[PDB]
Amino acid sequence: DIAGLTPCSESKAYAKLEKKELKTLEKRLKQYEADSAPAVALKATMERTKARFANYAKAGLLCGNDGLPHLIADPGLALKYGHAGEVFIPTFGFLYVAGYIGYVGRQYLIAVKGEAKPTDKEIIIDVPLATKLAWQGAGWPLAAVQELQRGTLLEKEENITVSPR
Amino acid sequence: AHIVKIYDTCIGCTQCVRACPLDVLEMVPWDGCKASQMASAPRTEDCVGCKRCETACPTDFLSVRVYLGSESTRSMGLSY
Amino acid sequence: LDPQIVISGSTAAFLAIGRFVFLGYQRREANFATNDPAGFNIIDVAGWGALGHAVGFAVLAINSLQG
Amino acid sequence: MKDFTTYLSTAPVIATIWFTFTAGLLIEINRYFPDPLVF
Amino acid sequence: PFVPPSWAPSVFVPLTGLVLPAIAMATLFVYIEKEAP
Amino acid sequence: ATKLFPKFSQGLAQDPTTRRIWYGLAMAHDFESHDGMTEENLYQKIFASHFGQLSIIFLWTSGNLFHVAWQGNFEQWVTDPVHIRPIAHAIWDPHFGQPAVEAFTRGGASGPVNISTSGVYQWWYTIGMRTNQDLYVGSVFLALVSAIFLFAGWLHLQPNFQPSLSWFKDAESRLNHHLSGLFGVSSLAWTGHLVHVAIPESRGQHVGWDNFLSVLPHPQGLTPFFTGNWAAYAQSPDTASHVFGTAQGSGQAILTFLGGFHPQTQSLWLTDMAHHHLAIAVIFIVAGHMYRTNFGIGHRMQAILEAHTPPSGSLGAGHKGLFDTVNNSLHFQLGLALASVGTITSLVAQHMYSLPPYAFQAIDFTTQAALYTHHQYIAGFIMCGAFAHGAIFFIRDYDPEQNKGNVLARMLDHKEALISHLSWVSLFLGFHTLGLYVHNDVMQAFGTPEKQILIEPVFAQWIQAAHGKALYGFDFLLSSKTSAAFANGQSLWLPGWLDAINNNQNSLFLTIGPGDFLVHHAIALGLHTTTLILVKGALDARGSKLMPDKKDFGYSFPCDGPGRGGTCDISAYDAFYLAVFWMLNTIGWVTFYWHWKHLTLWQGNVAQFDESSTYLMGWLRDYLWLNSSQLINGYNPFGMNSLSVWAWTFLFGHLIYATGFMFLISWRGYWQELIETLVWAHEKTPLANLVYWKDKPVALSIVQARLVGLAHFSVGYIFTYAAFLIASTSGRF
Amino acid sequence: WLRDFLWAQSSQVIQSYGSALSAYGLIFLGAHFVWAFSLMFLFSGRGYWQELIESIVWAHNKLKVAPAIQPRALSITQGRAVGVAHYLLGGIATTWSFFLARIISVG
Amino acid sequence: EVGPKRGSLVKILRPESYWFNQVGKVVSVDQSGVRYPVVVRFENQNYAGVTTNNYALDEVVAA
Ligand code: CLA
Ligand code: CLA
Ligand code: CLA
Ligand code: CLA
Ligand code: CLA
Ligand code: CLA
Ligand SMILES: CC1=C(/C=C/C(C)=C/C=C/C(C)=C/C=C\C=C(C)\C=C\C=C(C)\C=C\C2=C(C)C[C@@H](O)CC2(C)C)C(C)(C)CCC1
Ligand SMILES: CC1=C(/C=C/C(C)=C/C=C/C(C)=C/C=C/C=C(C)/C=C/C=C(C)/C=C/C2=C(C)CCCC2(C)C)C(C)(C)CCC1
Ligand SMILES: CC1=C(C/C=C(\C)CCC[C@H](C)CCC[C@H](C)CCCC(C)C)C(=O)c2ccccc2C1=O
Ligand SMILES: [Ca+2]
């Protein structure tokens, strides 16, 4: 559709690749008796291969002349043409998890900083406190906005060290 | 010869003088610090540039500073 | 478009606008003795005159392209 | 026991446990949802 | 037209890359080893 | 005692070791550091040095013209430029064996010769050169030009001819002349050559100093030019059936805007290039009348800069004090020139390959490859030099009090932010660009190529569509036949341009896919990382938290000793040294991409690059391993072929590259102790102890070793790739 | 040596993708990587890294995410030890992948 | 008794100091006329491993 690509569902190269892959697995399945554990394993890989080629096509992925799925990363083209589960949604999923890790770690460092030996709490992890922050990190995005709006997220330049210039 | 300089920040710890492996420094009477003594560099011609004095200097920033300069047989620490 | 007419008119127009309109602004921006009352020296003529020639040739050039 | 739990709270131990947990979680997911290319 | 003879390389290549280098190296080494009056 | 060399530094002249010889050669062009140096003498020395550089360049060009006219086959290549291989020069090696003589005998025989990959044959042919007499005369002229610049160099340094510092500081006058004359008049003179000689030669008419006056460039003469009927000059251009160099299909136009390429030569039209130089010549000549020199009109650069201050205080004092900052800093001036020339050099590489200006250049794959790689590597070194001089500027010329509140001082005030952000970008590109290649390699290894991450370069494809390419179906601007941008230019260049941009056999906007996406992010990784290293060096050149007084030690110093945790490679010079590795890595990636994409296009199977470029095993096996067979077979137990010199050079580069590793990994201390043992051995050896050294033998210095190692590393890098590039392209085509 | 040994016998490791020796191909590339990664430590000095860390520490200070345990560049000796380790690991692993893929295929 | 109070927290103003724009504790102020009488102790060590330094009255400010 976009970029002159073609649905994997209608690509002939996509179909030939699936046959090529299953024919390698079948050429090997022969040297073994039907119930032999080797045979069972090659069969389960063949079933997994058939499901992948079918699942990828059903997801409406586009395929290039190579017969391989290409991912659409433009938010505009992805939303208008049904390709948002390829890069857009993954982006907000990762950003949530990555911010989760960052906000929890920042909250931990801030908590241990007011202790007697912060350095000790960095080599020996205060597990109970760490677990508490780990659970409270689900609402980090709203907490990060509320900190950004109170002006408590950043540090005053006057309190940050710098070189002579 | 390398340029060795002492700064008013000197506290008269004498550590640089004890660390020097070529006797380029010594302690002279002074009135700027509590120790009433300040480091001096009267034999810089024998300095090689090891910078051990700077490693021994505990002030922030260093009170003794070495600037590598013209190279001689003594500056290159050559026994030949 | 008569070549002689286009250029001749173009040069005169720029010389006039530079002698009765932008002379003050240019002088202020500027922050060859001329007996001209507004002190329009020859170098000033060369400048505005050049502008006029360029604009004139441009008009004739595009007109020669017939559109 | 308190000292033993403090040793289990040491950076390397917690890292091994946390990374083993995270790796396991990802492996199991790919074991039940194989070949996940798109959402 | 501005064409050197066939022997040119048979002579120019030897001179430039062997003879001239030796002459250059000789004078250069002398100057460096020379000391200021 | 005090030796004579070097005369510019008594310090070095009083050094009793071998270091004096190395440092005397290494610090000869650093005039500012020479003993008794004054600003005026600094400028006069540079002025004379610049005349010396010009003399060398013109002799280099004269030398090139002479060897082609004396040992090459220009008069044979012109007859058949499609099948005749250009000769660079003859080979006279007495170490050669009879087989090697035969393998190197070619291009019309005439003895062993080297084929030329420089592209001068297509260049001189396009500019009207047709005979060895023409080449010979040009060689003489350029040799004469070299001698004049060498004399001018000598004279402008003699008394009564030594320009004053004020003359060197007359910025407004120098820029007016360089824009109007050096750039504008030169381009105008070139338009005259193209119209009076090159175009007639392309149409089969000889036009030389013998008949140029009795020959009319256009049948209507200059009447159209002075009457304003300029369009007349565009009437009747060469047709698609024009056989270059003959009147067959030849027109009469002198200035056109056809666009695209000549059908047979696959290069740009001479009439389009004549009109190009005429238009840019007019622009430059006008631009050269902007600054005030002596006639009461013009701009004062200081007044311009002083006026550019945002009213909201977003840029502090704006550009206040920058006039004097730039005018008094040659390092600042050199930093800008290198940064500009370096960017322009890369543009030359990108435009010359995509829009070939010389006839029969796009068919010479070897020359196309050589020119792009050569200019991209020279560009990389120049960019590195630009930042190096920016760091030197900050340490030697930057005066904080005279730049208080200005944009320059603001930069220093947020250097941590600038560096930390360049660090973040580099990290992101590195983790993701590497992660996607590795994911793809694992998917290829596990036999699942449909599972690899292949992001389409939609944003670039959208730009290509905008330029006319319809392969992507975006349908907009030049790709849309109902667009205004399409209609307005339909009677001008679009037709020729659209034909070329829609032809998938040239290099005009090649088709791009997921492989091109990954390599482009790799290029972005290299550009940001190399900039991070260079920028960090310039911003921290005057000081850091680890060394707050770095400015008192200068641009290049070994270190500050093992104290404070260790301070190896803390100087700004050390930053440049580290950046060169990243620059070579960047130009390596860019040149690999260009060569592989062209090798596949030239072979006629773009699919190979499209399917193998998405994983690094594909690059190693389908580009490096596969294209190295013929080269490594240049010489073997069964004999040798013309590719023997390249096989020998390929290995020669690997040796120099590895020799650099010794100066880069092993450090002085170890070597100094080894030499001391040798000094004992020489003095204790009978007869040998009779001869002695004038310079006490010592290990190379720390800074010297880093330079010698980087040089060996850089030379092997270039020699190895150059040997592989030429051999792979020439042997395969 | 380069042509008839390295280039000719590398065919097995470079063509192992899609088979059981595919791991040797991945390790062959991964080992070339670790070896090149060692050159960063072997050719550089801690003075440059310490300063770069200073600007990174600034960003962590600005967002109040700077660690109590002060980040420091590796010691000079550690820099040398890390470089040699990755050099030997990468180089020996590369020969390992080349040797095993080659021998198992043409054994 | 010139100088900041002992035990008080002050911010360093010496630009070349590792603790510039950082806060330390006033160990003691030398009433004798020494160039730098304020002894300040810091929790974070400098690159040399030192955690104390002397500063002039002007080089320090209550913070
Ligand atoms: C970050 C770099 C980047 C780049 C290079 C592009 C590039 C592009 N985007 Mg875009 N986009 C981006 C980020 C980017 N986008 C982000 C972060 C978002 C989230 C809001 C979007 C949301 C978006 C939408 C909703 C649309 C595009 C569309 C497009 C294509 C045409 C848009 C245009 O005219 O100019 C380039 C655009 C930008 C430089 C920035 C954002 C795009 C603008 C805001 C959309 C305006 C599109 C406009 C209607 C032109 C298309 C007309 C018609 C075909 C719809 C183009 C190839 C259009 C498209 O082709 O859809 C089929 C479309 O409608 N983008
Ligand atoms: C609380 C943990 C934490 C947080 C919130 C941040 C935040 C940030 N870092 Mg960072 N960093 C961290 C840890 C952290 N870092 C560690 C442990 C290291 C040593 C490897 C680094 C090394 C590092 C570098 C070299 C750089 C940053 C940079 C940055 C900034 C740019 C965004 C970025 O993340 O780049 C990417 C950061 C990384 C890839 C480092 C990954 C660190 C892991 C994933 C965090 C885990 C922390 C800890 C184990 C969790 C403890 C939880 C607790 C309950 C026990 C950003 C503000 C960049 C910057 O300065 O931009 C301005 C930059 O160049 N960091
Ligand atoms: C018409 C007046 C005029 C002209 C023609 C020149 C010309 C020149 N001056 Mg100059 N100058 C002038 C007036 C003039 N000056 C005045 C009035 C002053 C006093 C204020 C000065 C003060 C001055 C100084 C202090 C210096 C010069 C220098 C130079 C030389 C620059 C060297 C160079 O870069 O190569 C030539 C540069 C060009 C040809 C510009 C074009 C570059 C483009 C980017 C290349 C593109 C080419 C094309 C696209 C592709 C080519 C393909 C193929 C042909 C290869 C140059 C030849 C320098 C010098 O002395 O060198 C010896 C220098 O130091 N001048
Ligand atoms: C118009 C261009 C230009 C100009 C006029 C200058 C001018 C200057 N530079 Mg400079 N520079 C430039 C471009 C330029 N540079 C570029 C493009 C780079 C990036 C590579 C650099 C990088 C650079 C650095 C890092 C330094 C300078 C320095 C200097 C100053 C003194 C150094 C010197 O010249 O001593 C003499 C120079 C040499 C003796 C050259 C050294 C030998 C090298 C390794 C070349 C050897 C190659 C070898 C022949 C290969 C053999 C192969 C063969 C066997 C086949 C001087 C004022 C130095 C400085 O700032 O002063 C303190 C310094 O530190 N430059
Ligand atoms: C193949 C060799 C190699 C590699 C891979 C790198 C990589 C890198 N260099 Mg580098 N460099 C090299 C050679 C190399 N260099 C050489 C020879 C020199 C000359 C001495 C330099 C000089 C140099 C300088 C001066 C600088 C860099 C910088 C960087 C970083 C730039 C930011 C980035 O891209 O983040 C991307 C991150 C990666 C590519 C690493 C991938 C993540 C790993 C592999 C995943 C973890 C694997 C697994 C989970 C755990 C493995 C360990 C195991 C024992 C548990 C980057 C990581 C800059 C920097 O420091 O960044 C701020 C910089 O300042 N380099
Ligand atoms: C390919 C790279 C390379 C090369 C060629 C060498 C070569 C050498 N290393 Mg070395 N080394 C290297 C990399 C390299 N190393 C690296 C990366 C490291 C870091 C670990 C080291 C660390 C190291 C140490 C610690 C030591 C050496 C030592 C030596 C020397 C051993 C004695 C010897 O064999 O003398 C003979 C010379 C050769 C075998 C070189 C062959 C050159 C050819 C055959 C000669 C051709 C000459 C030619 C015709 C001249 C005319 C040219 C023309 C232009 C005029 C030797 C010259 C040892 C030493 O100092 O010597 C005792 C020593 O202790 N190396
Ligand atoms: C809260 C949080 C943290 C974050 C802290 C801070 C201050 C982060 C700073 C963010 C800043 C200053 C961002 C500045 C500019 C960002 C810009 C201009 C955004 C660019 C994004 C663009 C253009 C979008 C691109 C696309 C979208 C729509 C999504 C995908 O489809 C992919 C793509 C590229 C097409 C801490 C502490 C690191 C801890 C953790 C949690
Ligand atoms: C005095 C007076 C008067 C007036 C008079 C007059 C009449 C004046 C005028 C004068 C003039 C009459 C002026 C003019 C000028 C012009 C010029 C100065 C021009 C120039 C040109 C140019 C510069 C051109 C260039 C170019 C070429 C060459 C080529 C193409 C392109 C172009 C066109 C661009 C009056 C009565 C009012 C009053 C009283 C007195
Ligand atoms: C890159 C490099 C560095 C920088 C290298 C560093 C800082 C090593 C980085 C080690 C880790 C990544 C730092 C943090 C380790 C944490 C324990 C990781 C925790 C993160 C969780 C996910 C576990 C030097 O310090 C150096 C010194 C001397 C010569 C060369 C070099 C050199 O090349
Ligand atoms: Ca002719």
Q: What one-character-per-residue DSSP string does C6-36 give?
A: HHHHHHHHHHHHHHHTSHHHHHHHH------
Residues of G in contact with F566 (CB under 8 A): 45-47, 50, 73, 75-76
Q: Which pair of tokens denotes residue F304?
A: 């311009």
- Rounded to whole angstroms, the Cα distance separating G65 from A106 reads 5
Identify the residue whose tokens are 């030849």: F250
- Rounded to whole angstroms, the Cα distance separating C46 from A32 reads 98
| Alpha carbon nearest to ligand 6 atom 12, residue | F662
Residue type, F603: Q
Q: Identify the CA nearest to F688 among candidates F676, F696, F679.
A: F679
Query: What letter would DSSP give residue G7?
Result: I
- Rounded to whole angstroms, the Cα distance separating B41 from B4 reads 6
- Rounded to whole angstroms, the Cα distance separating F349 from F207 reads 31
Q: Method of determination? A: cryo-EM
Residue type, F719: F
Contact assessment for residue F665 and residue F649, using Cβ atoms and an 8 Å cutoff: no
Q: From the alpha carbon of F431, which atom of ligand 2 is closest?
A: 39
Helices G22-43 and F644-665 sit at what angle, rounded to 10 degrees? 50
Question: Which one of the ligands is nearest to F665 CA?
Answer: 6
Neighbours of F223 (CB within 10 A): 10
Q: How many CB pairs under 8 A join B and F?
A: 49
Residue F404 main-chain phi, psi, to 5 deg: -65, 125
Separation of CA F389 and ligand 2 centre (Å):
33
Task: Provide the residue range defining the domain that includes F393.
Answer: 3-733
Residue type, F351: H
CA F385 to chain centre: 12
Query: What letter would DSSP give residue F640?
Result: E
Residues of A in contact with G54 (CB under 8 A): 163
> What was the resolution (in A) of this experimentally determined structure?
2.5
Strand B26-29 to B3-6 pairing = unpaired
Strand partners, H26: H40
Q: From the alpha carbon of G40, which atom of ligand 9 is closest?
A: 33
Contact assessment for residue F533 and residue F582, using Cβ atoms and an 8 Å cutoff: yes
Reduced to 3 states (helix: H, G, I; strand: E, B; else coil), residue B60 is coil
- Rounded to whole angstroms, the Cα distance separating F423 from A7 reads 39
Separation of CA F270 and ligand 2 centre (Å):
57
- Rounded to whole angstroms, the Cα distance separating F460 from F172 reads 41
Neighbours of F403 (CB within 10 A): 20
Strand partners, A7: A62
CA distance H48 to chain G (A): 12
The pick from C53, C55, C57, C64 for probing ligand 8's pocket by mutation, whose C-beta has the most ligand atoms within 8 angstroms, reads C53
Contact assessment for residue H40 and residue H26, using Cβ atoms and an 8 Å cutoff: yes
CA F195 to chain centre: 29
Q: Which helix (H) or strand (E) holds F636?
A: strand F635-636
Q: Which pair of tokens denotes residue E8?
A: 């040119």
Q: Identify the CA nearest to F35 among candidates F57, F7, F64.
A: F7
Q: Identify the CA nearest to G79 among candidates G47, G34, G35.
A: G47
Q: Identify the CA nearest to F356 among candidates F505, F211, F463.
A: F505
- Rounded to whole angstroms, the Cα distance separating B61 from F462 reads 57
Neighbours of F514 (CB within 10 A): 24
Helices F702-732 and F572-603 sit at what angle, rounded to 10 degrees? 10
Q: Identify the CA nearest to F328 among candidates F153, F525, F171.
A: F171
- Burial label for H28, CB within 10 Å (0-12, 13-18, 19+), is middle
CA F32 to chain centre: 27
In angstroms, what CA-CA distances link F389 with F168, F342, F346, F537, F568? Answer: 20, 13, 20, 11, 21
Sorted by sequence, the CB contacts under 8 Å of residue A17 that are 6+ apart come out as A53, A67, A68, F449, F450
Neighbours of F199 (CB within 10 A): 27
Residue F430 main-chain phi, psi, to 5 deg: -65, -50
Contact assessment for residue F5 and residue F24, using Cβ atoms and an 8 Å cutoff: yes
Residue E35 main-chain phi, psi, to 5 deg: -110, 150
Q: Which pair of tokens denotes residue F208?
A: 């030389």
- Rounded to whole angstroms, the Cα distance separating A11 from A68 reads 9
Q: From the alpha carbon of C46, which atom of ligand 8 is closest?
A: 18
CA atoms within 13 A on the CB side of D39: 15
Strand H38-41 to H23-29 pairing = antiparallel
Q: Which helix (H) or strand (E) holds A7?
A: strand A6-7
CA distance F142 to chain B (A): 45
**Facing residue for F458 by CB, picked from A2, A24, A52:** A2
Q: Is the dihedral of CA A141, A143, A147, A152 positive or negative?
A: negative
Helices F415-445 and F514-539 sit at what angle, rounded to 10 degrees? 150
Strand H38-41 to B3-6 pairing = unpaired
Separation of CA A105 and ligand 2 centre (Å):
9
Q: Which pair of tokens denotes residue A94?
A: 């990762």
Residues of H in contact with F543 (CB under 8 A): 16
**Maximum C-alpha span of chain A:** 78
Contact assessment for residue B60 and residue H19, using Cβ atoms and an 8 Å cutoff: yes
Contact assessment for residue F81 and residue F360, using Cβ atoms and an 8 Å cutoff: yes
Contact assessment for residue F727 and residue F634, using Cβ atoms and an 8 Å cutoff: yes
Contact state of F607 with A65 under an 8 Å Cβ cutoff:
yes
End-to-end CA distance of chain F: 62
Contact state of D9 with A126 under an 8 Å Cβ cutoff:
yes
Pocket of ligand 8 (CB under 6 A): C 11, 15, 45-46, 49-50, 53-54, 57; F 282
Contact assessment for residue H39 and residue H3, using Cβ atoms and an 8 Å cutoff: no
Contact assessment for residue B52 and residue B64, using Cβ atoms and an 8 Å cutoff: no
- Rounded to whole angstroms, the Cα distance separating G41 from F207 reads 63
Identify the residue whose tokens are 């072997």: G42
G48 in a known ligand binding site: yes
Closest residue, chain A, to H19 (C-alpha)? A161
Chains D and A touch (3+ CB pairs under 8 A): yes
Length of chain G equals 107
Helices F132-155 and F39-71 sit at what angle, rounded to 10 degrees? 160
CB G59 near ligand 2, within 6 Å: yes
Neighbours of F373 (CB within 10 A): 23
Question: Which one of the ligands is nearest to F566 CA?
Answer: 9
Contact assessment for residue G91 and residue G31, using Cβ atoms and an 8 Å cutoff: yes
Closest residue, chain G, to F648 (C-alpha)? G2
| Alpha carbon nearest to ligand 8 atom 15, residue | C49
CB G91 near ligand 9, within 6 Å: no
- Rounded to whole angstroms, the Cα distance separating F506 from F504 reads 6
- Rounded to whole angstroms, the Cα distance separating F480 from F162 reads 62
Closest residue, chain A, to D10 (C-alpha)? A124
Closest residue, chain F, to B58 (C-alpha)? F564
Q: Identify the CA nearest to F596 among candidates F391, F372, F429, F404.
A: F372
Which letter, b or e, does each residue of F293-332 get, where b requires 16 or more Cβ atoms within 10 Å of its Cβ?
Answer: eeeebbeebbeebbeebeeeeeebbbbbbbbebbbebbbb
Task: Provide the residue range defining the domain that includes C31.
Answer: 1-67
End-to-end CA distance of chain B: 18
Residues of D in contact with F451 (CB under 8 A): 35, 37
Reduced to 3 states (helix: H, G, I; strand: E, B; else coil), residue F246 is coil
Q: Please list the alpha-helical segments (H only) found in G5-45.
A: 8-9, 11-14, 22-43
- Rounded to whole angstroms, the Cα distance separating H35 from B59 reads 14
Sorted by sequence, the CB contacts under 8 Å of residue F268 that are 6+ apart come out as F261, F262, F355, F356, F357
How many domains does the structure of chain C reveal?
1
Q: Is G70 on the interface with H (CB under 8 A)?
A: yes
CA distance D1 to chain F (A): 39
Contact assessment for residue B51 and residue F537, using Cβ atoms and an 8 Å cutoff: no
| Alpha carbon nearest to ligand 5 atom 64, residue | F533
Contact assessment for residue A113 and residue G68, using Cβ atoms and an 8 Å cutoff: yes
Q: Which pair of tokens denotes residue F632?
A: 């490594």
How many domains does the structure of chain H reveal?
1
Task: Give chains near D: 3+ CB pairs under 8 A.
Answer: A, F
Separation of CA F614 and ligand 5 centre (Å):
21
Q: Identify the CA nearest to F608 among candidates F594, F626, F622.
A: F622
Q: Which pair of tokens denotes residue E7?
A: 């022997």
Neighbours of F14 (CB within 10 A): 16
**Any idea what the Cα angle at residue F488 is, between residues F483 and F493, rounded to 5°?**
110
- Contacts of A119-127 spanning 24+ positions with Cβ under 8 A: A119/G68, A119/G69, A121/G68, A122/D11, A122/G67, A122/G68, A122/G69, A123/D10, A123/D11, A123/G69, A124/D6, A124/D9, A124/D10, A124/D11, A125/D9, A125/D10, A125/D11, A125/D14, A126/D9, A127/D9, A127/D14
Contact state of A61 with D37 under an 8 Å Cβ cutoff:
yes
Length of chain H equals 63
Q: What one-character-per-residue DSSP string does F415-446 give?
A: HHHHHHHHHHHHHHHHHHHHHHHHHHHHHHHT
In angstroms, what CA-CA distances link F72 with F86, F88, F731? Answer: 7, 6, 21
Separation of CA F204 and ligand 10 centre (Å):
9
Separation of CA F275 and ligand 10 centre (Å):
22
- Rounded to whole angstroms, the Cα distance separating F140 from F270 reads 26
**Facing residue for A164 by CB, picked from F451, F452, F548:** F548
Identify the residue whose tokens are 């393998």: F103
Sorted by sequence, the CB contacts under 8 Å of residue E22 that are 6+ apart come out as none
Neighbours of F265 (CB within 10 A): 25
CB A14 near ligand 7, within 6 Å: no
Helices A12-29 and A37-58 sit at what angle, rounded to 10 degrees? 170
Instruction: Give the per-residue SS3 of F88-140.
Output: EEECCCCCCCHHHHHHHECCCCCCEEEECCCCHHHHHHHCCCCCHHHHHHHHH
Query: What letter would DSSP give residue F619?
Result: I
Sorted by sequence, the CB contacts under 8 Å of residue F630 that are 6+ apart come out as F643, F727, F728, F731, F732
Question: Strand (E) positions, chain H?
Answer: 9-12, 23-29, 38-41, 52-55, 60-62
Strand partners, F115: F87
**Any idea what the Cα angle at residue A53 is, between residues A50 and A57, rounded to 5°?**
140
Reduced to 3 states (helix: H, G, I; strand: E, B; else coil), residue F279 is helix
How many domains does the structure of chain F reveal?
1
Query: What letter would DSSP give residue F27?
Result: T
Q: Say whether the peptide bond before residue C37 is cis (omega within 30 degrees of 0).
A: no
Contact assessment for residue F506 and residue F266, using Cβ atoms and an 8 Å cutoff: yes
B10 in a known ligand binding site: yes
The pick from G65, G70, G72 for probing ligand 2's pocket by mutation, whose C-beta has the most ligand atoms within 8 angstroms, reads G65
- Rounded to whole angstroms, the Cα distance separating F422 from F412 reads 15
Q: Is H33 on the interface with F (CB under 8 A)?
A: no
Residues of F in contact with B80 (CB under 8 A): 676, 679-680, 683, 696
Closest residue, chain D, to A52 (C-alpha)? D35
Q: Which pair of tokens denotes residue F466?
A: 């905008």
CA distance F11 to chain B (A): 5
Identify the residue whose tokens are 């390790």: G27
- Rounded to whole angstroms, the Cα distance separating H46 from H63 reads 20
Strand partners, H25: H9, H41
- Rounded to whole angstroms, the Cα distance separating F81 from F94 reads 32
Sorted by sequence, the CB contacts under 8 Å of residue F87 that are 6+ apart come out as F68, F71, F72, F73, F107, F108, F113, F114, F115, F116
Query: What letter would DSSP give residue F628?
Result: G
Annotated binding site of F for chlorophyll a: 654, 662, 670
- Burial label for G13, CB within 10 Å (0-12, 13-18, 19+), is buried
Contact state of A161 with H16 under an 8 Å Cβ cutoff:
no
- Burial label for F406, CB within 10 Å (0-12, 13-18, 19+), is buried
Q: What strands lie across the sheet with H60-62, from one edge to the other? A: H52-55, H38-41, H23-29, H9-12, H60-62
CATH of D1-39, picked from 1.20.5.510, 3.40.50.1820, 1.20.960.40, 3.40.50.10580, is: 1.20.5.510
Q: How many CB pairs under 8 A join A and D?
A: 38
Instruction: Give the per-residue SS3 of A29-84.
Output: HCCCCCCCHHHHHHHHHHHHHHHHHHHHHHCCCEECCCCCEEECCCHHHHHHHCCC
Chains C and F touch (3+ CB pairs under 8 A): yes
Contact assessment for residue F480 and residue F488, using Cβ atoms and an 8 Å cutoff: no
Separation of CA A76 and ligand 1 centre (Å):
5
B33 in a known ligand binding site: no
Sorted by sequence, the CB contacts under 8 Å of residue H27 that are 6+ apart come out as H6, H39, H40, H41, H52
Separation of CA A95 and ligand 7 centre (Å):
8
CB A106 near ligand 7, within 6 Å: yes
Task: Provide the residue range defining the domain that includes H8.
Answer: 1-63
**Any idea what the Cα angle at residue B29 is, between residues B24 and B34, rounded to 5°?**
110
- Rounded to whole angstroms, the Cα distance separating F383 from F392 reads 14
Length of chain F equals 733
- Rounded to whole angstroms, the Cα distance separating A107 from A121 reads 13
| Alpha carbon nearest to ligand 1 atom 26, residue | A76
Reduced to 3 states (helix: H, G, I; strand: E, B; else coil), residue F311 is coil
Length of chain C equals 67
Sorted by sequence, the CB contacts under 8 Å of residue H17 that are 6+ apart come out as B60, B61, H53, H55, H59
Q: Say whether the peptide bond before residue G43 is cis (omega within 30 degrees of 0).
A: no
End-to-end CA distance of chain D: 46
